[PDB]
Structure 1
Amino acid sequence: LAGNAARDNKKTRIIPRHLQLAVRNDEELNKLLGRVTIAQGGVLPN
C-alpha cells in the first residue's frame, strides 16, 4: 500500500507520509493501527 501511494505521488521512495496515508485510508489496517500515530505522517485531505 505504501508503494502504491508512492506511485501516485510519483516518488520512487516511500516516506512516512505515504506510510500514514495508506494506514489511514485503508479501513482494515486503520482498525489495526488506529491508536498508533505515524511520525511525520500528516493528516488525510478532507
Structure 2
Amino acid sequence: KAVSRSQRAGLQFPVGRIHRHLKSRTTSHGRVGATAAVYSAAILEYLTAEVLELAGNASKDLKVKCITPRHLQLAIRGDEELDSLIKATIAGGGVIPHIHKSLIG
C-alpha cells in the first residue's frame, strides 16, 4: 500500500513534488537524492511556519482573523533575521510607522 514520502518524513510540504522540481533545476544529467528533497521540504516548511507565526501574532494583536499582506510586512520587517533574508517588495504591505525625532513638533 502506497505511503506518501511527506508522511514518511513527518512533513506537510510535498516531498515527491519537490523532488521533481529539484530534478528539473540541477545541472545536465544531474541526479537528486531522495533525502535532498526531504531536507529541502523540511526547510521550506520551517521558514513558512516562522513567517506565519509572526504574521498571525501581528494579526491577533490587531484583533482580526485573517493574515493580510500588511501583517506579513509588519512581521517580516519587525524581525531582523526575516528582514535580512527577505529583501523583496511585499505588495500591498505598506511601511512600518516611524517619524524621526527631529520632525515632531
State the Cα RMSD in Å: 0.6
Identify the structure with the greater helix proportion: 2
Q: Structure 2 length as normaliser, TM-score? A: 0.42
User: Match of 1:28, as an amino acid?
Assistant: E
The list of structure 1 runs, each at least 4 consecutive aligned residues, that deviate by more than 3 angstroms after superposition, is none
Q: Structure 1 length as normaliser, TM-score? A: 0.92
Equivalents in 2 of 1:22, 1:37: separation in Å? Answer: 14
Structure 2: runs of 5+ lacking an equivalent: 1-53, 99-105
* Map of 2:61 onto structure 1: 8
Structure 1: runs of 5+ lacking an equivalent: none
Greater RCO structure (CA 8 Å; 6+ sep): 1
Larger radius of gyration: 2
* Map of 1:45 onto structure 2: 97
Percent pairwise identity = 62
